[PDB]
Design an enzyme around this catalytic site. Structure first.
Site, short mmCIF file in Angstrom:
data_model
loop_
_atom_site.label_atom_id
_atom_site.label_comp_id
_atom_site.label_asym_id
_atom_site.label_seq_id
_atom_site.Cartn_x
_atom_site.Cartn_y
_atom_site.Cartn_z
N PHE A 198 26.94 20.26 17.87
CA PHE A 198 27.65 19.36 18.81
C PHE A 198 29.15 19.51 18.84
CE2 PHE A 198 29.85 15.79 16.61
CZ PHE A 198 29.48 16.00 15.30
N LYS A 199 29.77 20.12 17.83
CA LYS A 199 31.21 20.20 17.84
C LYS A 199 31.70 21.15 18.87
CE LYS A 199 31.64 18.26 13.25
NZ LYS A 199 32.03 18.33 11.79
N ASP A 200 30.85 21.95 19.51
CA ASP A 200 31.28 22.75 20.66
C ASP A 200 31.70 21.84 21.83
OD1 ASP A 200 30.59 25.28 19.54
OD2 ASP A 200 28.53 25.06 20.34
N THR A 230 31.75 23.51 11.52
CA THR A 230 32.99 23.14 12.19
C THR A 230 33.85 24.36 12.47
OG1 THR A 230 32.92 20.98 11.12
CG2 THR A 230 35.00 21.66 12.08
#
Length: 464
Positions: free
Chosen positions: A124-126, A157
């Site tokens: 999800f950090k994209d 990350t």
């Protein structure tokens, strides 16, 4: 106007762009907006049908009045494309960016996965990082200068950061990772990058040794000035904003009209998602519950259950709101932690704000997550990872007949293969698009667990 959780910024002006690069405030606090921008009923109606990039523009525009609207729209439209968010594994339309996949009805509620992990690094950090890449490049162009980001990672990350910043003008990334201590997929995604502005440093230590070196460089103010050192960690407000967007997208995808309410479940007690979901609700998004899955983490469980901590950037933003947005109270809480060995929000009368804000929590065990992975593979014919399984297990404890429940998919199975092998007796499924990744030539510099070695490397690779 942006102010500090610890009191700085009153009588000053900090715009979104002023704080973009993600420094702490002058007093050690975190920046937050002085109010949460409100979405009217008319606005919410208008936004329902927007494509992701345009919805992102609308939300970013509420938080940033200093960047020309046309430029913000260009930035979000460049960032959120089907090509970047291409790894939709359940038949979804990648142009949705975060497609919603409905599993089925449970306790009378439609249960869905919000696919946040279809970007270049499959987690999800994209969502936030891709946006930060463009925002950083845009802002740094105004001064003709370079930001030399220094970070640490155990794989996820740093991957997201490197895929967002590779090839961006005015940015370099110096990424510390623990040598031979990450998973093969994550290692390959980072180290296979040949981009000249990406510097992977494999530290002969563990992840905490990498974090310690980033902290030590943080304390060397002269070096930070000399080398124009940056961060993209959770101190970054723009990352939180970015995450607000997909709560709006998921809400609209899960509903037919704005008369409906939706609940969300956030895996892994992640305070950035806690914060983002809370902020969306505070802006007027019709979220019913924000369910926080805390796996077997006793500290997080204890906090959400009781309001107490006995001795995270985004914990501090959340607790600021629990304490009425009073920075004096935040400073006291940190004084209680340092002077008295913890805090107790029940005793102080502040714990009531957790339920007020729609929060509830639950736990999962390893056995629970394996069972949930197996259930989903058999009943809904799809693979989910351990984090998503933590989420789904907890989500299932908070279903209300008639209220959609949306579980965030925060990593794809390929990122956490051990539990997939244990649950399903096989490797995560993967398409031809990823064949050979782990065998690609890897580019990295091995360094010892030595802060001066890292400083020397940076100085020799920036031209400063």
């Amino acid at each position: 106007n942006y102010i500090s959780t610890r009191g700085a910024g009153i009588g000053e002006r900090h715009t979104f762009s002023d704080i973009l690069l993600g420094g702490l405030a002058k007093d050690g606090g975190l920046y937050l907006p002085s109010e949460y921008p409100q979405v009217s009923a008319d606005e919410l109606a208008r936004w329902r049908t927007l494509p992701y990039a345009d919805l992102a523009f609308e939300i970013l525009s509420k938080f940033c009045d200093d960047i020309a609207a046309a430029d913000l729209r260009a930035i979000t439209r460049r960032t959120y494309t089907a090509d970047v968010y291409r790894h939709a594994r359940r038949g979804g339309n990648a142009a949705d960016i975060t497609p919603l996949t409905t599993l089925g009805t449970e306790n009378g509620a439609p249960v869905s996965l919000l696919e946040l992990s279809n970007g270049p690094t499959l987690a999800f950090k994209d969502m936030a990082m891709q946006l930060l890449g463009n925002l950083f490049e845009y802002t740094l162009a105004k001064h003709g200068e370079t930001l030399n980001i220094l970070g640490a990672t155990s794989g996820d990350t740093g991957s997201a950061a490197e895929y967002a910043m590779r090839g961006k003008e005015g940015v370099r990334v110096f990424m510390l990772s623990p040598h031979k201590k990450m998973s093969a997929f994550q290692t390959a995604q980072m180290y296979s990058l040949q981009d000249p502005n990406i510097f992977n440093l494999a530290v002969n230590g563990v992840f905490d040794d990498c974090q310690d070196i980033v902290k030590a460089v943080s304390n060397d103010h002269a070096f930070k000035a000399q080398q124009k050192i940056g961060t993209v960690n959770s101190i970054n407000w723009a990352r939180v904003v970015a995450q607000v967007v997909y709560y709006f997208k998921g809400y609209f995808a899960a509903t037919r009209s704005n008369d409906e309410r939706v609940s969300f479940t956030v895996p892994s007690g992640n305070f950035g998602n806690v914060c983002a979901g809370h902020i969306a609700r505070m802006m007027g998004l019709p979220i019913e519950k924000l369910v926080v899955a805390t796996n077997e983490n006793d500290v997080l469980d204890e906090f959400f259950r009781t309001g107490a901590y006995r001795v995270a950037s985004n914990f501090e933003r959340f607790v600021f709101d629990l304490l009425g947005r009073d920075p004096a109270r935040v400073v006291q809480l940190f004084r209680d932690v340092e002077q008295k060995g913890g805090f107790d929000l029940a005793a102080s009368g502040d714990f009531a704000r957790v339920a007020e804000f729609g929060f509830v929590s639950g736990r999962s065990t390893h056995a629970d997550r394996i069972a949930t992975i197996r259930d989903v593979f058999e009943r809904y014919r799809t693979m989910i990872d351990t984090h998503t399984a933590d989420g789904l297990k907890v989500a299932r404890e908070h279903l209300r007949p008639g209220v959609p429940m949306v579980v965030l998919e925060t990593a794809q199975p390929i990122k956490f293969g051990e539990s997939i092998r244990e649950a399903l007796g096989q490797e995560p499924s993967r398409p031809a698009a990823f064949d050979g990744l782990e065998a690609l030539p890897q580019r990295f510099e091995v360094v010892d667990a030595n802060a001066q070695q890292v400083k020397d490397f940076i100085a020799a690779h920036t031209g400063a």
